[PDB]
Tab-separated table of C-alpha atoms and ligand atoms in Angstrom:
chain	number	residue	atom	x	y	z
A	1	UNK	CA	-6.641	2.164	10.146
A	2	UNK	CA	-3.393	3.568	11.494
A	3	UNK	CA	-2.304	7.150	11.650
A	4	UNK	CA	0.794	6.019	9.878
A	5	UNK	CA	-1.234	5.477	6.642
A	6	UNK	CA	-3.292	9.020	7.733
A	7	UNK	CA	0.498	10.822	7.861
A	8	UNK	CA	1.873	9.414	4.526
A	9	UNK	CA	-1.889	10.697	3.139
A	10	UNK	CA	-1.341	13.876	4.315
A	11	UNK	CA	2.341	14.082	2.734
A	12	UNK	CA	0.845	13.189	-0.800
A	13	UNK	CA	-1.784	15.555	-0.524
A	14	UNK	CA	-0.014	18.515	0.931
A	15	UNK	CA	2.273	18.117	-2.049
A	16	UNK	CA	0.098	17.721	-4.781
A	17	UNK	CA	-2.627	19.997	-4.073
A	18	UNK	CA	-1.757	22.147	-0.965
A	19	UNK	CA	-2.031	22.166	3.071
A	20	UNK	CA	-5.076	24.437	2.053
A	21	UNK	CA	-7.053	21.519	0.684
A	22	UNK	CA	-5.543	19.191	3.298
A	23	UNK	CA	-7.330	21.205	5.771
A	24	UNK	CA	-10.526	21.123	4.175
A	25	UNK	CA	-10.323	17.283	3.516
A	26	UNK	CA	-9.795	16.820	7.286
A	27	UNK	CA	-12.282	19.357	8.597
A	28	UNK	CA	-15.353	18.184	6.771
A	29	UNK	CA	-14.466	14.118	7.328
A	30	UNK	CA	-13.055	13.822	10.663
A	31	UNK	CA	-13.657	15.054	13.997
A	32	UNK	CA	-13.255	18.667	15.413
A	33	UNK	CA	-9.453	18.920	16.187
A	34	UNK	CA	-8.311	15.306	14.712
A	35	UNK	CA	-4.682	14.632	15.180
A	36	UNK	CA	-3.837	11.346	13.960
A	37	UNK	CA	-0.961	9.830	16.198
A	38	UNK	CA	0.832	7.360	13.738
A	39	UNK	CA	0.808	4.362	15.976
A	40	UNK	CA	-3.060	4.780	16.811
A	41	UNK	CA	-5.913	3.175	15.578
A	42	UNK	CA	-8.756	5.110	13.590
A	43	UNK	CA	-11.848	4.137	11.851
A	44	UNK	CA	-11.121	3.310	8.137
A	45	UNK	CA	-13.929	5.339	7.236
A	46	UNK	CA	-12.148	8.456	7.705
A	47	UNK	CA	-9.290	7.763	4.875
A	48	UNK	CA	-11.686	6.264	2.517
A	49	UNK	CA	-13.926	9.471	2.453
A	50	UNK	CA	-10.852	11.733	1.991
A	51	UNK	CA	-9.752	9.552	-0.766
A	52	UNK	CA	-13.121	9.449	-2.584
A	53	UNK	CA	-13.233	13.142	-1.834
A	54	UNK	CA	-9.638	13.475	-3.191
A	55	UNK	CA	-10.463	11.358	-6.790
A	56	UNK	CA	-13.248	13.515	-6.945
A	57	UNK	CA	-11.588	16.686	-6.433
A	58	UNK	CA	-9.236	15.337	-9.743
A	59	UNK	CA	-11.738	14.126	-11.520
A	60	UNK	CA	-10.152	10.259	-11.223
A	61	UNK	CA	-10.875	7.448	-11.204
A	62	UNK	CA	-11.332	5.825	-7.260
A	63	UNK	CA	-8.428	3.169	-7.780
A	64	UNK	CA	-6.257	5.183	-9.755
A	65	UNK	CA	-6.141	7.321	-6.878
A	66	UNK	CA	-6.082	4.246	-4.713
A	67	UNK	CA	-3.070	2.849	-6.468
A	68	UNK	CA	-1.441	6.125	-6.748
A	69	UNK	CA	-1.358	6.601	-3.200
A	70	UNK	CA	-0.313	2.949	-2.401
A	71	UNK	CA	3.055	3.791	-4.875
A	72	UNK	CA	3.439	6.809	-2.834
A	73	UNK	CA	2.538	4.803	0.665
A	74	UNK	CA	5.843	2.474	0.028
A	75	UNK	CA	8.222	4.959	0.182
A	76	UNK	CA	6.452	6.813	2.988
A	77	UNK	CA	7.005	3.487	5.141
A	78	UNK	CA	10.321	2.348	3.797
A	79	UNK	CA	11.813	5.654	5.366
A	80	UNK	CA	9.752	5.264	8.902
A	81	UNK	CA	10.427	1.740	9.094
A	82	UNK	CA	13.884	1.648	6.943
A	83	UNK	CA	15.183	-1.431	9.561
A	84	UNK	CA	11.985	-3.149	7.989
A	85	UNK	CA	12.718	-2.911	4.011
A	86	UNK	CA	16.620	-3.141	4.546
A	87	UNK	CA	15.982	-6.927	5.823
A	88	UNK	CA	15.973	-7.316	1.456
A	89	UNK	CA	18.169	-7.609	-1.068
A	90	UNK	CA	15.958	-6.803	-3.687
A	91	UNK	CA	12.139	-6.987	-4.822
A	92	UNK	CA	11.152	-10.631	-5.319
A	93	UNK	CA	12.935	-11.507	-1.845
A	94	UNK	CA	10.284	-8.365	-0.406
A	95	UNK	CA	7.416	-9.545	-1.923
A	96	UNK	CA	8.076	-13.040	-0.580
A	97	UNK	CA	8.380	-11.799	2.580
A	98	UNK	CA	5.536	-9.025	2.996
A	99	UNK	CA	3.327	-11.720	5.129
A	100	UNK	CA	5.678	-13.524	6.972
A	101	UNK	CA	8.580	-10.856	7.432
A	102	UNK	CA	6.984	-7.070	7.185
A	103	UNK	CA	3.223	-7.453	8.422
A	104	UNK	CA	4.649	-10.045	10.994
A	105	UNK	CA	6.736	-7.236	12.138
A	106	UNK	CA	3.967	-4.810	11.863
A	107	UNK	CA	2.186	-6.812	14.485
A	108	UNK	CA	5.203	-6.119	17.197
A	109	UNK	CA	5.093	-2.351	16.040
A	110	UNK	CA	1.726	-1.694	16.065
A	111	UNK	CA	-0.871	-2.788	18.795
A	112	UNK	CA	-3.790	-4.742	16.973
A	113	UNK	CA	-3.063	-3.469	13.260
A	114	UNK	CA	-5.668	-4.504	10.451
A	115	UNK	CA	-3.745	-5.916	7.977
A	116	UNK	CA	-4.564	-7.941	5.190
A	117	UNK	CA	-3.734	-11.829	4.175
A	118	UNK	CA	-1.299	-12.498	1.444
A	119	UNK	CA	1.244	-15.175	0.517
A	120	UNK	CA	3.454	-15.043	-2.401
A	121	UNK	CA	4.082	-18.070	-4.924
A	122	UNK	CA	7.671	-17.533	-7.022
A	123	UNK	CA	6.403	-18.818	-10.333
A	124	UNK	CA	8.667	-19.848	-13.922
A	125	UNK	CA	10.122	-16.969	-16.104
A	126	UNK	CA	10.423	-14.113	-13.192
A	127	UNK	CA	6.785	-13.924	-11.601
A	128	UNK	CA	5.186	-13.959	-8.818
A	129	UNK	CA	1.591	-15.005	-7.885
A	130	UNK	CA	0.722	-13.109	-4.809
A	131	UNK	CA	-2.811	-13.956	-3.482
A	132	UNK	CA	-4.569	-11.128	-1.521
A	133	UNK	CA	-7.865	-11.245	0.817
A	134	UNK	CA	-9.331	-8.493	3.004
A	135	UNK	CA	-12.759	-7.098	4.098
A	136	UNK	CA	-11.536	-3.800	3.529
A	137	UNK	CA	-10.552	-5.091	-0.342
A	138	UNK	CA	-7.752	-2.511	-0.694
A	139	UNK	CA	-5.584	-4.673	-3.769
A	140	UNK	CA	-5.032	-1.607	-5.592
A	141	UNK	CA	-3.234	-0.408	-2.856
A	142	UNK	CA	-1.180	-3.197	-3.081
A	143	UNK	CA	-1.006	-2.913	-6.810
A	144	UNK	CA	0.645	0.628	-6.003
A	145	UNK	CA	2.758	-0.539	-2.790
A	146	UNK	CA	4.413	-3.208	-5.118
A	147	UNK	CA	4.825	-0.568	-7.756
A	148	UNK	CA	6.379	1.340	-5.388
A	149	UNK	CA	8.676	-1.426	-4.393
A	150	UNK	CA	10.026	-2.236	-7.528
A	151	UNK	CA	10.566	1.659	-7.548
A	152	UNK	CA	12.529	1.279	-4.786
A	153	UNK	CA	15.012	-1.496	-5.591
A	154	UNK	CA	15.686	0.345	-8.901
A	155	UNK	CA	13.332	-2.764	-10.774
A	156	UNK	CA	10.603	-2.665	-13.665
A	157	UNK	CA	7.662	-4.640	-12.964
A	158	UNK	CA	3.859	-5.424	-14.603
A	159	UNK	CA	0.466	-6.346	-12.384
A	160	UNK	CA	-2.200	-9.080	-14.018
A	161	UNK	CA	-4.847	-8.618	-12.045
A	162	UNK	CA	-7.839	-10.565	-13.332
A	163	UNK	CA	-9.188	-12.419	-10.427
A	164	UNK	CA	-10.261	-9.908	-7.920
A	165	UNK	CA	-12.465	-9.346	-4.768
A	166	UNK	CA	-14.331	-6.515	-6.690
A	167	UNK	CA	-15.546	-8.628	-9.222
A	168	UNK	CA	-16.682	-11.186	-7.083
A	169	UNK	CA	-13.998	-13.357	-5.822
A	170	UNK	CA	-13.099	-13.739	-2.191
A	171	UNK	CA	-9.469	-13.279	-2.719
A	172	UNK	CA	-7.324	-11.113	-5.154
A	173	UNK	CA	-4.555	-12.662	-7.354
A	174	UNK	CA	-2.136	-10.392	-8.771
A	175	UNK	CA	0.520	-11.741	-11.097
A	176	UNK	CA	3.626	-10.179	-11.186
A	177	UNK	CA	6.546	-10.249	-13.607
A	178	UNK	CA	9.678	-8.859	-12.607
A	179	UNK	CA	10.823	-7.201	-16.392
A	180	UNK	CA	14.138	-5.848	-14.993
A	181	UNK	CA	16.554	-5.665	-11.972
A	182	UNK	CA	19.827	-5.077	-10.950
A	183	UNK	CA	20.662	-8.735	-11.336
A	184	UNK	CA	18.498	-9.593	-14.237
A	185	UNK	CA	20.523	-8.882	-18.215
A	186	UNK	CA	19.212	-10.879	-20.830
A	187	UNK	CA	16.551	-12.921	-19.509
B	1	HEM	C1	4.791	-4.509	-1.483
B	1	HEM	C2	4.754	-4.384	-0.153
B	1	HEM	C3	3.448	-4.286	0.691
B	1	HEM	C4	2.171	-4.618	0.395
B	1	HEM	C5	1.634	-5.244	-0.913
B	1	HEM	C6	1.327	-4.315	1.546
B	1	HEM	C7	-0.055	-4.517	1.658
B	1	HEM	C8	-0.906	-3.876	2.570
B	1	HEM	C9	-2.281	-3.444	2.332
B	1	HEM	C10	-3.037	-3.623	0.987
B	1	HEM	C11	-2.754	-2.872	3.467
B	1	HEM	C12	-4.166	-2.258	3.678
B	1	HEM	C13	-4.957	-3.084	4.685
B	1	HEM	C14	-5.657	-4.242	4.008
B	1	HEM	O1	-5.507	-4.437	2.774
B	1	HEM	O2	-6.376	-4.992	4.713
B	1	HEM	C15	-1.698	-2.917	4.481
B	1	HEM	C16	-1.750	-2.442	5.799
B	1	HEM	C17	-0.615	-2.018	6.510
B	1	HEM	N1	0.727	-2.362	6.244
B	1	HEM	FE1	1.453	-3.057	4.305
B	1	HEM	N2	2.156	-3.784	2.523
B	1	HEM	C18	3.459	-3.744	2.036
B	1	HEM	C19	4.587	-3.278	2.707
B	1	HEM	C20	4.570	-2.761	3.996
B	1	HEM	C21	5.689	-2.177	4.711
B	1	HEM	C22	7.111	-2.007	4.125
B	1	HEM	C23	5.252	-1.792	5.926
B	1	HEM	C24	6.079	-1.139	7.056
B	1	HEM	C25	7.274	-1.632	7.387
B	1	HEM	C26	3.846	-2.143	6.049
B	1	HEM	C27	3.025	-1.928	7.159
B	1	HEM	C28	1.634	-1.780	7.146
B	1	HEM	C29	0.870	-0.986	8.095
B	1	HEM	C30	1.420	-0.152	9.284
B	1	HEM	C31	-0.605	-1.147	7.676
B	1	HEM	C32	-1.829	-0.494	8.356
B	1	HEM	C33	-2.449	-1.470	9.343
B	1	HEM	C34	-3.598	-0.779	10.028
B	1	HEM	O3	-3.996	0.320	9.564
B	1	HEM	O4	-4.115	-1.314	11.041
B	1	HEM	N3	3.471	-2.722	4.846
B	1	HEM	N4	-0.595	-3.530	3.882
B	2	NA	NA1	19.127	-5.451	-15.171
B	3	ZN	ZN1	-8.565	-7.049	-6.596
């Protein structure tokens, strides 16, 4: 897991609740002194108990904090890696292109990144099935980075998300109709 995704963490947390419980987070579940370097690798281990520490802290539940965090993650990488997002027009061309265009950049950004497989399907009447597969089984995330995308082109979108890792699939697929853009009026 990259310090990148550590940084953005930090952001959301600092602003909802405070550096004060940033500081606990990070001294009980990481090492003495961690700085996390945004272009280093650290064990995934690390967010995941400061995120179930987090949703427990609220009172939430795990993938609402998950997905939360994922809407908040977009923007956090959209601004350090604006060259990245500004390669689209608008949301469906983004999604299309998070495989072969974004995490394909990722990979000459980052040494080694873990990063999961997805490929995108444009489908009738505005949607898009994007199939998603990792160990680390993060799709809420990506239910919340797409969320966050939509937020970001200004577009109004809804998730179907009834095949899933979690329930005992080896993939993800999350259906995705675009409601509303800047180039969509009636239908
Ligand atoms: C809707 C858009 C996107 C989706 C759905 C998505 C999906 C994901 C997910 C779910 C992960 C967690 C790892 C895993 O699931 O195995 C991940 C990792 C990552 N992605 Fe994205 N992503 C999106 C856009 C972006 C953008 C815009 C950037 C930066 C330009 C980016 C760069 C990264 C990085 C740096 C990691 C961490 C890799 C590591 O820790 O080793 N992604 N991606
Ligand atoms: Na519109
Ligand atoms: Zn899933």
């Amino acid at each position: 897991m990259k310090g990148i995704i550590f940084n953005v963490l930090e952001d959301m947390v600092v602003a909802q609740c405070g550096m004060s419980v940033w500081n606990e987070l990070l001294e009980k579940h990481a090492p003495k002194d961690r700085v996390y370097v945004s272009a280093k690798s650290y064990a995934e281990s690390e967010l995941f108990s400061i995120v179930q520490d987090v949703a427990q802290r609220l009172n939430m539940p795990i993938q609402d904090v998950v997905k939360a965090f994922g809407q908040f993650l977009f923007n956090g990488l959209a601004s350090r890696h604006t060259d990245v997002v500004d390669k689209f027009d608008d949301f469906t061309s983004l999604v299309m292109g998070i495989h072969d265009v974004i995490h394909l950049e990722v990979n000459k950004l980052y040494h080694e990144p873990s990063l999961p497989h997805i490929n995108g399907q444009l489908l009738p009447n505005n949607q898009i099935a994007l199939r998603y597969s990792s160990p680390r089984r993060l799709c809420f995330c990506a239910e919340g980075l797409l969320f966050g995308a939509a937020q970001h082109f200004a577009a109004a979108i809804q998730i179907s998300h009834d095949t899933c890792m979690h329930t005992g699939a080896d993939h993800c697929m999350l259906i995705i109709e675009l409601q509303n853009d800047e180039n969509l009026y009636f239908q």
